[PDB]
């Protein structure tokens with residue numbers, strides 16, 4: 001089994017298991033702002049409340065779960081401060097009373113000082129009833145940006161698909177041990193088990209229609225997910241007052257920072273990060289925005305022999321069929337995702353085109369990996 | 373690799389799966405000089421680039437080739453030689469005499485097998501540091517040692533291009549630095565086991581290897597001349613990523629639809645220098661252009677060597693360990709490694725002034741800033757000035 005040092009959970013996988021809901025009393029001033037973003041943004045009192053804060057030390061965040069909650073809290077406040085109401089007026093400087101401890105905590109956790117997928121998706125959740133299962137009805141997010149932003153639906157549906165895909169992670173050690181031991185039948189059962197997990201993850205995906213609406217996603221949520229890397233609104237980046245002299249550019253929160261999807265492309269030999277193209281460059285850059293243990297996990301998978309090369313080298317139709325079942329399940333997920341992105345991004349934009357090409361290039365690379 | 377999946381990142385030994393040699397390190401040990409007779413048509417062109425470019429017959433000889441299958445390259449060394457052969461021909465075809473006329477399309481009879489072999493080896497279809505430096509060499513006498521006098525390159529671009537000097541001197545510095553690679557497992561085991569004296573001897577041994585590598589560097593003056601390097605060799609090292617001569621990249625006829633952009637051969641693709649920055653916690657790859665360039669150049673390294681660098685990043689921080697000890701001796705040994713890197717990079721800046729900066733001014737920079745930023749990042753990693 002996968003070492004504890006990789007921080008992969010048996011149940012939720014790359015998601016943070018049982019995230020912390022509240023910070024120690026020393027940080028109640030941060031917690032008040034973060035828990036009241038919809039009202040403080042709408043009223044215009046948010047930027048003032050941030051500017052009125054006293055610079056706190058990160059020294060009172062003892063455990064990893066408190067450090068991860070503080071990252072989500074500070075990250076949500078930073079996005080809200082920079083974008084405000086999201087109708088034009090951008091703040092180009094992050095005050096030192098928040099930027100200093102944000103960059104300090106970010107340096108400790110080896111993550112950039114910007115809200116990432118690991119903050120608003122992997123750590124932004126809770127069970128309503130701990131005795132009930134991990135289903136949409138029994139879950140909620142810790143923070144939202146605005147009322148009606150569909151943040152709960154967007155984040156929880158991504159999280160539920162992450163957990164659905166995570167069921168195949170435990171099969172990875174079996175795949176590599178079966179190749180080493182030359183256990184052909186074991187590798188076939190293992191590849192077929194991974195395919196069924198990825199097929200089950202596509203069924204989970206269907207919930208996106210019931211908890212997100214195109215208008216709220218396109219006109220509201222999108223604003224707060226935006227970063228400052230190649231953005232004309234902050235052409236040189238953001239100033240992290242009292243930490244850096246020059247403004248630093250960081251990419252916004254992306255599902256391209258999800259370790260589960262990157263790990264199945266690595267596992268199946270789908271060279272998503274190879275080729276020198278924009279899609280490959282983006283996905284490689286997004287690894288720097290993943291928790292360090294999860295970034296280490298992906299590299300360890302790349303250090304292991306190629307499952308695709310092994311299957312190609314065997315002249316075994318059954319083994320090729322099992323390998324192709326995994327690849328087909330990934331093409332199916334990415335093809336369904338493209339239809340969702342057409343409904344939620346492409347069509348609302350007409351009532352953008354680059355995101356379609358990025359997803360189509362990623363999907364095409366997966367399709368071209370089929371042995372047949 | 374399976375053990376690291378079950379017990380976590382731990383580099384107690386350098387596995388053979390990383391393709392690092394005990395003697396030449398990241399360089400390809402004993403590279404193949406000749407391809408099977410099936411590829412003599414490629415070999416003729418590659419071995420005669422100076423004469424074929426100068427005569428004007430080169431582009432014609434490439435266009436006259438029949439598309440050969442990569443199926444007759446069985447071993448890894450033949451595949452690496454074919455990459456160097458095809459890569460050298462591609463650079464010569466694209467640039468020609470290098471005085472204006474560029475070819476924006478690579479013919480399919482060469483581009484198809486080049487991209488096929490490149491896809492197998494997980495490297496881009498452009499000449500990389502691993503081709504013209506790590507695989508472009510041979511021992512004149514196998515019984516004599518790895519010294520400049522007993523070595524030669526397999527391919528050159530033009531007569532008097534100083535390719536032998538530029539490539540072999542880079543290679544000899546690579547091998548000099550490689551002697552410290554075997555000390556890496558000792559460093560990680562000493563930190564795990566809390567063996568303070570062992571870690572001190574290990575850090576001092578790495579420093580002496582990096583100090584010996586600066587002495588090796590001095591040979592650059594005797595085998596390279598500024599005029600030949602600036603007016604000739606530079607042309608053939610140029611790539612097609614952000615180049616105004618091939619603004620959209622190169623067309624790899626019969627392999628890709630759109631023209632693909634790839635960066636030219638760079639010493640920023642050297643795994644030995646990147647691995648000592650990773651080992652010493654010099655965050656060379658951590659938002660600026662210099663950091664982005666060095667991270668991108670990892671995609672141009674052999675896959676096993678790219679995996680080696682990420683495995684080093686997965687292991688605990690030697691810098692954090694040394695900082696946390698309040699031990700002047702351990703800090704002095706750590707600083708000896710960092711100082712040896714600052715010394716190398718400072719001597720290199722003087723070489724780049726002599727070979728690039730001054731020749732550029734004697735005619736009717738961004739690379740200076742890149743090197744200065746890399747050197748500054750190394751200097752700022754010193755615990756005590």
Ligand code: HEM
Nearest residue numbers: 157158161162212254255256258261334340341344355362
């Ligand atoms: C409202 C529905 C959704 C929309 C509009 C949407 C949109 C997008 C966009 C625009 C990208 C491109 C990267 C970027 O610009 O950040 C992307 C990438 C991606 N999305 Fe979604 N997404 C949706 C739902 C989901 C869900 C539920 C998941 C499940 C985890 C998911 C997983 C991914 C993955 C893994 C990528 C990276 C590329 C790939 O591996 O195919 N998406 N998505």
Ligand code: HEM
Nearest residue numbers: 541542545546596638639640642645717723724727739746
């Ligand atoms: C004729 C002498 C030399 C010149 C003019 C020269 C020039 C350059 C240039 C222009 C770069 C910037 C990157 C690029 O544009 O691709 C560079 C980087 C570099 N060069 Fe050289 N070089 C010389 C000799 C050497 C030798 C002998 C080595 C030994 C291995 C070496 C090692 C490096 C390294 C490691 C880098 C990456 C940046 C760094 O880590 O400091 N150079 N060089």
Ligand SMILES: O[C@@H](c1cn(-c2ccc3[nH]ccc3c2)nn1)c1c(C2CC2)sc2cncn12
Nearest residue numbers: 116117120121158222225253254255256345352
């Ligand atoms: O990649 C993120 C994203 C950016 N945009 C976006 C970016 C640019 C845009 N332009 C016009 C619409 C639009 C939407 N949507 N989603 C994302 C998530 C974030 C929590 C981190 S969760 C998820 C699942 N599939 C994608 N994502």
Ligand SMILES: O[C@@H](c1cn(-c2ccc3[nH]ccc3c2)nn1)c1c(C2CC2)sc2cncn12
Nearest residue numbers: 500501504505542602606609637638639640728
């Ligand atoms: O990075 C490569 C390079 C580019 N240029 C260059 C780049 C821009 C220029 N502008 C005017 C002259 C000129 C030369 N020199 N060297 C390089 C090597 C390549 C074989 C792989 S070997 C080596 C050691 N130090 C650097 N290098």
